Paper text:
Modulation of voltage-gated potassium (Kv) channels by auxiliary subunits is central to the physiological function of channels in the brain and heart. Native Kv4 tetrameric channels form macromolecular ternary complexes with two auxiliary β-subunits—intracellular Kv channel-interacting proteins (KChIPs) and transmembrane dipeptidyl peptidase-related proteins (DPPs)—to evoke rapidly activating and inactivating A-type currents, which prevent the backpropagation of action potentials. Here we report cryo-electron microscopy structures of the Kv4.2–DPP6S–KChIP1 dodecamer complex, the Kv4.2–KChIP1 and Kv4.2–DPP6S octamer complexes, and Kv4.2 alone. Thus, our data suggest that two distinct modes of modulation contribute in an additive manner to evoke A-type currents from the native Kv4 macromolecular complex.
The 3D classes that contained four DPP6S molecules were selected for further 3D refinement with C2 symmetry imposed, because two DPP6S dimers were integrated with C2 symmetry in the complexes. Owing to the flexible position of the large extracellular domains of DPP6S floating above Kv4.2, the overall resolutions are 4.2 Å and 4.5 Å for the Kv4.2–DPP6S and Kv4.2–DPP6S–KChIP1 complexes, respectively. The dimeric crystal structure of the DPP6S extracellular domain43 was used as a guide to construct the atomic models of the Kv4.2–DPP6S and Kv4.2–DPP6S–KChIP1 structures. In the extracellular region, two DPP6S dimers float above the channel core.
Residue numbers in the entry:
A (entry chain I), B (entry chain J): 59 to 787
Write the structure that this text describes.
């Protein structure tokens, strides 16, 4: 007999925004092989020279005075830096606002401004590879300044506001393919810049309604392609930083299946050579091409094509110091059960006669990314799910014929399993972060000794908070269906008892090409609810989850809805067969694409066990893929315009007809830029036709990602305050 | 052993939309001294005479096969019939559609057409007063045809789509002040037409979002002058039906405080002289003016003004056949409690030295509208509130010094005790209709014998249905605060039991010049919920409502909402003393302006007696009157643009701040043009900042007047479903 009270306060709503839980990552980047940038720890920014415990104050409590410049970065000369803050701060991935130049010693603000124009907003500044040369993007125009005090030079200015995007990515590139906003890349020599110019005039335009703006609010118009519409028309240009600065346009290939090209990847192969990944409009035919920036001569080095589509076309080709044989990562057949994503080798100049396909790694697992390759001998470092899909571990292999894989850390202090590392220019030291399943562990390590030769950032306060609050028990119960094994992640409220029945939630994302069951450390509304309300949560990554086989990924190609619905529902079936789960209170949640799923999965099982969930909800739930971005629609459903009959069954209406007793809900901001309000509007219309019971909460004229702490706090509060009633008996 | 069965079934929403409760009112109109239209009640169109039960079917039941024309009007010569079908209403009265002309007996339907154009949608056609002459308004252009066989001829075409209106009303001149879409007047002889030209060029424009139209739904722009904006430029023009049809325009007076004006009332004095009412922008000066058509010159007749505002702007004076003294209705002091609305005599040509004002009526009551004046006698027939403000009865005063208002209707029927009458050209024969609280009756009568020859429509189905189900018993309970009187209405399902407790739902409308506590028979969601769900619903006409004193109207100048809030909370506190009613379950409802009330009456009384309303709700509420039409904001809260500071204290936002835990609902269609959705969006923003629980529903791209049955039943089902789980414990 024992009691074991363990009376510690349950996690409240504010805990996610409590400074104790305010996880800090310096996000160090190797300035050289002997030191890293060592950004803000708790204020001043030092330069912790990794050689021998030496820290030099490069930045001090001075950016606090400069109107709280959110972002900061120092030029390669380490002598003049740029600070940047925001006025009317919009950054979902936008990152606009004010830029300022400043001095390395201290103080000295300097408004980096467009020529002939005073202090004004700037899109992006960045740094060059050499000395203090910088650029800045004003109203879709790239201007360059080799010297900090040098008068601005209009390198290119033909870009137009919302019409021509050169030096920055438009919304489709900012959200669907590049997933990054910067569309310029410096050459290795710091003399040339390769950028992308996008014409958007032919692109169809939508207008987001506005209410809260003014007494006569007007719609914000911008281009937003859809299925069967006109995609942005991109071109690739190269312009020098000095002298003539000639613009050179690179010719894409003219294959019969190469109708329209997406620039999924472009990188300087050398100071004059460049490697570009060009994908067909159907997103099922990719071509890796090697071109010459100063010459413009293009020649293909590889080509791949898949029946369904190509995944992770954002490959990063890591090159040698002189354009010698380099590395790549791609899907090799790997026999049965999916052409797994493994590493591959390319020679310096692969002849058109044959390819250099050389799987450095082989096995039923995938490499998430290639970390780095260093030329003294044979060392490729990378992150992979080799040990387990739900974990990202560090691995190293050798480029010489031995091809021997090797772990580096394989667990460290306080239960760390998840890994993510980053090497320097010359292997001298590499950073490593845990971010799971414990507190993130910012650390330095040395390639030879492989030892933590000083603690970088541990966040002991986070451990104190996690031991001072009822952090819910983490559990795993891998499931298996048909010809695949599906991960899972059930949670228990740390006061659980097998005798006491407890309610259940299913959290679903199911994004095609991503994963939800990961050992990354995270605290969100689910953690609070399992703490504040004590309901188990289920995270099942059904068919189409990433890093689990290309065949599994393509299982849902043009077959959305049903398969993932089957997986999530069968996860619910598996959870109900226990004695600690009461059928009275079982709920679901979703968001973004998962919102779709969060709506698609409310049918009746059998006849006695109908109305599978008492309550459900969604957030920004995509419902019609015709009304969503073309780069996404055509990817998983093919090109429109020819009536492919791949959209009628995709509409969630077909499933929402029943809605017998489920207490549904929708939360959707008015001014959503990713998933338009039209999706919620159509769903509500269909619901009205079906005459169902639901409630709606709205955010008037707000962005999609909730980049305001008040917005996120209110959102999590609303979700909790919604599940409380339907989980109360 | 067998007692068989008893008891009658209660009332459910399905009953409302069953055919049983439909009030098939024919709405007959006195064509001549001894005949009325006797329009459709259960099919065919039949003409009747008062002499001896004369039956004359003019049109068969062919409207069903005539594409189910929504409306029809016979030609004034009783020779042609105009059918209106395929109507797509946009406002309350903008029934744009298709018009087809046909011969009186039957056969040969002919589609009215614009010149040189085939069948197309028509804004309005109408009929003339004599012969077969007609007009029609197409794309804001008035064309006329004296001869039906004669094709369309151009008459006036200055109109522009949404900018220039000829003979019709814009939104402001349809819904706020003129309260109808009729802006054209036929001369008694059918020789000239008087039409209003509305210029919207300087009127600001607002877009209403569309969320359902197509792949890229676009906003709808229309001219909605907000508070502190420029009202449309209205001019009056008289045109001839023959010859050159040279236009002549009316010249308004030029008092220094009436430059910006509304033509709030204009009625033909004769076939060439007219009386027109100009109400200035501050609506504090209303000049009645006599104009001659052939010269275009307007001669001033009289002026009216008040310490707060003018009222009853569309009471058309009745001009005698000789143009002698017309008996208009103006605010005479009538002792205390403000200047009651009593009849004023005005001679044909009153001397400028002194007018011929004469208070025909008198008493602690007023006249709602004046039917006619028997030129062959000292009899003037009208409808007035002589008995009670909540009942209207027919009366006949003496235009000469007799001044005897006779007891004609005056409770001549046992049940309704509430009346509405309409006389002929000779006023010998008149139609009478009860319209509550009993089942409405339509009856013929003569003013000589005051005898009921036969009932025109008895609503037999309505009577049997009102006897079928357990009706809610009607009750009344006057209240008084200070020197103000306020009626009240309350219902019970008539199967009330004192032991069982029932909750209270408070319904408010509260708009100036209205009467929520009325003895009108009606079937709605209120009685359905009272019957089936067992609740008692209270209506209390607070301060600011009309028909009970010009002072009791005008005291709310710039203080619109607070006084009626005090009246309603007094009603709550003085009604919750019942031993069969409880403080736990108290709920409120609101609509349009009442939504503000439904939100403005939820504080926490003191500190202990909080939780005033358990589950409140509202429809299209208004919180910031700046975002609303100037003709309502300025008219009661003071003119906008001057920062009256009533536009910063009449916001319920600071009032809805507390709302600590009370659940609340909002319902608002997307395409609302009564109270723009911006009000709801701002309210939601405040609530998110206020951090209070709320719910919401949406109707995408739906007008405010609920022009469909399915939408109406969905709304009623949704509101009753909201209330049913918010009452039961």
């Amino acid at each position: 007999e024992d009691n074991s009270l363990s009376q510690k306060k349950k996690v409240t709503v504010e805990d996610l925004f409590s400074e104790d839980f305010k996880i800090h990552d310096p996000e160090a980047k190797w300035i050289s092989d002997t030191e890293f940038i060592y950004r803000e720890q708790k204020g001043t920014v030092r330069l912790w020279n990794v050689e021998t415990n030496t820290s030099t104050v490069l930045i001090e409590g001075k950016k606090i005075e400069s109107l709280r410049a959110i972002r900061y970065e120092i030029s390669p000369d380490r002598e003049y830096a740029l600070f940047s803050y925001n006025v009317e701060p919009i950054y979902q991935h936008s990152y606009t606002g004010y830029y300022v130049l400043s001095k390395i010693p201290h103080g000295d603000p300097q408004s980096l401004d467009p020529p002939e124009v005073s202090n004004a907003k700037l899109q992006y500044a960045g740094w060059g590879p050499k000395g203090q040369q910088l650029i800045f993007i004003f109203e879709n125009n790239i201007y360059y300044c080799a010297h900090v005090g040098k008068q601005a030079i209009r390198v290119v200015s033909t870009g137009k506001e919302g019409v021509i995007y050169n030096g920055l990515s438009d919304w489709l590139y900012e959200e669907e393919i590049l997933k990054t906003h910067i569309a310029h890349w410096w050459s290795p020599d710091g003399t040339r810049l390769a950028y992308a110019a996008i014409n958007d005039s032919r692109v169809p335009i939508m207008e987001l309604p506005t209410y809260t703006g003014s007494i006569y609010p007007t719609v914000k118009p911008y281009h937003y392609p859809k299925a069967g519409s006109e995609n942005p028309s991109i071109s690739l240009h190269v312009i020098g930083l000095n002298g003539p600065t000639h613009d050179l346009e690179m010719m894409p290939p003219d294959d019969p299946r190469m109708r329209e090209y997406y620039i999924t990847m472009v990188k300087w192969a050398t100071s004059t050579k460049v490697a570009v990944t060009w994908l067909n409009r159907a997103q099922n035919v990719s071509i890796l091409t090697l071109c010459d920036a100063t010459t413009g001569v293009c020649t293909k080095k590889h080509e791949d094509e898949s029946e369904a589509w190509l995944h992770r076309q954002n490959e990063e080709p890591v090159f040698s110091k002189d354009g010698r044989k380099f590395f790549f990562i791609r899907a090799i057949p790997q026999g049965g059960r999916g052409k797994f994503y493994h590493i591959t080798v390319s020679s310096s100049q692969p002849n058109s006669s044959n390819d250099n396909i050389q799987s450095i790694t082989s096995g039923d697992w995938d490499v998430t990314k290639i970390l780095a390759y260093d030329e003294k001998g044979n060392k490729i470092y990378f992150l992979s799910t080799e040990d387990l899909p739900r974990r990202r571990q560090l691995y190293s292999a050798n480029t010489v014929g031995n091809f021997n894989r090797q772990c580096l850390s394989c667990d460290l202090v306080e239960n760390c399993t998840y890994f993510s590392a980053s090497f320097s220019h010359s292997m001298d030291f590499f950073l490593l972060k845990c971010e799971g399943p414990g507190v993130p562990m910012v650390t330095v390590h040395n390639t030879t000794d492989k030892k933590k030769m000083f603690d970088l950032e541990t966040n002991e306060h986070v451990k104190k908070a996690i031991n001072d609050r009822q952090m819910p028990k983490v559990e795993y119960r891998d499931i298996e269906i048909d010809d695949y094994n599906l991960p899972m992640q059930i949670l228990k409220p740390a006061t659980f008892t097998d005798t006491t029945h407890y309610p259940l939630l299913l959290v679903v994302d199911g994004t095609p090409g991503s994963q939800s069951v990961a050992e990354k450390f995270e605290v969100s509304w689910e953690t609070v609810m399992v703490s504040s309300h004590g309901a188990v949560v289920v995270k099942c990554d059904g068919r189409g989850s990433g890093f689990q086989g290309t065949k599994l990924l393509h299982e849902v190609r043009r077959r959305l809805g049903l398969l993932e619905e089957k997986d999530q529902m069968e996860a619910v079936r598996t959870m109900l067969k226990e004695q600690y789960i009461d059928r009275t209170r079982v709920a679901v949640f979703g968001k973004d694409y998962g919102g779709y799923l969060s709506t698609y999965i409310l049918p009746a099982k059998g006849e006695n066990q109908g109305q599978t969930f008492t309550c459900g909800s969604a957030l920004s739930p995509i419902t019609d893929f015709k009304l969503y971005a073309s780069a996404f629609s055509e990817r998983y459903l093919g090109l429109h315009g020819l009536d492919n009959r791949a959209y009628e069954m995709t509409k969630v209406a077909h499933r929402v007809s029943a809605l017998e007793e489920q207490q549904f809900l929708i939360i959707h901001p008015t001014a959503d830029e990713k998933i338009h309000f039209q999706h919620t509007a159509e769903l509500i219309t269909q619901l009205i036709r079906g005459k169902a019971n639901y409630s709606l909460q709205i955010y008037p004229d707000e962005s999609h990602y909730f980049t305001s702490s008040s917005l996120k706090q209110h959102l999590y509060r609303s979700i909790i305050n919604f599940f409380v009633e339907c989980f109360r008996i």
